């Protein structure tokens, strides 16, 4: 669905139309923001350390692994999503690309079914 590109500092460089629909931030609003604006606390507070940690250590926790996370929308409502990260690099700098699958639908069916 969503695609998003950050600099090695977690600043949003690119923001696809999907993500716009997914998160409810227009591309402009979104560009030049910290990516943490898309998650809840406590994650939202740590995200930078998530990044400085990987930079100095080169140990991947999501990169090439993938994970299921809670994402936060603009109007504050949260959701699950599968998150994948790609490391590229341009202008000598490392750039990260997030691909996002919304899982709201699956989680809700699974709840509904559990409930019945
Ligand atoms: C909006 C919801 C998001 C959440 C909740 C989330 C959560 C996380 C978590 C949990 C980690 C490392 C976990 C650990 O240390 O065990 C992480 C690391 C990282 N995330 Fe975020 N993420 C989100 C979106 C994004 C997006 C869209 C990108 C764009 C590329 C991104 C880039 C990164 C990078 C580069 C790392 C370090 C690499 C690694 O840990 O392998 N994140 N994030």
CATH number at residue 95: 3.30.450.20
Q: What is the dihedral of CA 49, 50, 51, 56, to 10 degrees?
A: 80
Separation of 48 CA from ligand 1 center, angstroms? 9
Q: In Å, what is the CA distance from 59 to each residue of 64, 74, 112? A: 11, 31, 38
Q: How was this structure determined?
A: X-ray
Residue 96's nearest CA partner among 69, 62, 70 is: 62
Q: How far apart are CA 97 and CA 116, in angstroms?
A: 39
**Rg, Å, the chain Cα set:** 15
Resolution in angstroms comes to: 2.5
Cα 47 to its chain centre, rounded Å, is: 10
When divided into structural domains, the chain yields a total of: 1
> Nearest C-alpha to atom 8 of ligand 1 is from which residue?
47
Q: Where are the beta strands (DSSP E) in 61-113?
A: 67-72, 78-90, 93-102
Provide the domain limits for residue 83: 1-116
19 lines ligand 1 (CB under 6 A): no
């Amino acid at each position: 669905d969503a695609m998003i590109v950050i600099d090695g500092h977690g600043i949003i460089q690119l923001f696809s139309t999907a993500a716009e629909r997914l998160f409810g931030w227009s591309e402009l609003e979104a560009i030049g923001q910290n990516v943490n604006i898309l998650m809840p606390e406590p994650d939202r507070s740590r995200h930078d350390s998530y990044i400085s940690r990987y930079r100095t250590t080169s140990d991947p926790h999501i990169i090439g692994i993938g994970r299921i996370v809670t994402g936060k929308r603009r109007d504050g409502t949260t959701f699950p999503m599968h998150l994948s990260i790609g490391e590229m690099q341009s202008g000598g700098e490392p750039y990260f690309t997030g691909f996002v699958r919304d899982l709201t639908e699956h989680q809700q069916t699974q709840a509904r079914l559990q409930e019945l």
